[PDB]
């Protein structure tokens, strides 16, 4: 039955994850491992359905981690997803400084695919700045790829200064 | 709204 | 094309 809940929380079909977490006895097919190890969280919160994470959220779901170290808002930033990641937000507080395999967060995620309200909802947050696997902030991260309004919307914000503090003197990529 | 059809479509004879 | 799809779909067991 873990296939069936994986398709309905893949895309969002709020009644059929009702009728499936009917039986609230046995937790351990809520938070299942899949074939890239991704629980029903990542799956709802990688296509953004507010809902249907909500209601994950509400049945008790772990912010368990993937093969890769991700997590729901990771997926949720790097879709760019404002919902999903205000509810995630909303729960809980610890989740926000978390590291994956490569020493990313999910504010470098959001600042790398230029999305700029998420770097905003992050950023009116605590986001706890830090550097890569490569000593690449969030900010050379969107340097890199050109994206306009995300270094605009981070000149606009109030913790621009502390941005310009922190880099690596010994990097020749990263200056 | 390609996406809407997607959740809200019904799904008999195709499951599993 | 695809608004005709949502305007013509049948949906049972997804409403509310």
Redesign the interface.
């Given at each position: 039955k873990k296939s069936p809940l994986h398709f309905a929380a893949s895309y969002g079909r709020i009644n059929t994850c009702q009728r499936l977490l009917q039986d609230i006895s046995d937790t351990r097919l809520l938070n299942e491992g899949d074939l890239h190890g991704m629980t029903p969280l990542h799956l709802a919160a990688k296509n953004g359905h507010d809902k249907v994470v909500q209601l994950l959220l509400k049945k008790g779901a772990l912010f368990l981690s993937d093969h890769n170290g991700w997590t729901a808002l990771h997926h949720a930033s790097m879709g760019g997803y404002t919902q999903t990641m205000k509810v995630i937000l909303d729960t809980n507080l610890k989740c926000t400084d978390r590291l994956d395999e490569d020493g990313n967060t999910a504010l470098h995620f959001a600042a790398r695919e230029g999305h700029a309200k998420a770097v905003a909802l992050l950023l009116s947050h605590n986001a706890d700045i830090v550097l890569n696997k490569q000593q690449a902030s969030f900010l050379h991260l969107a340097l890199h790829n050109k994206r306009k309004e995300v270094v605009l919307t981070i000149i606009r914000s109030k913790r621009w200064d502390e941005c310009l503090k922190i880099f690596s003197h010994n990097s020749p990529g990263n200056k | 709204?390609?996406?809407?059809?997607?959740?809200?479509?019904?799904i008999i004879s195709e499951?599993?």
């Open positions: - | 709204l390609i996406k809407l059809i997607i959740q809200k479509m019904e499951t599993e």
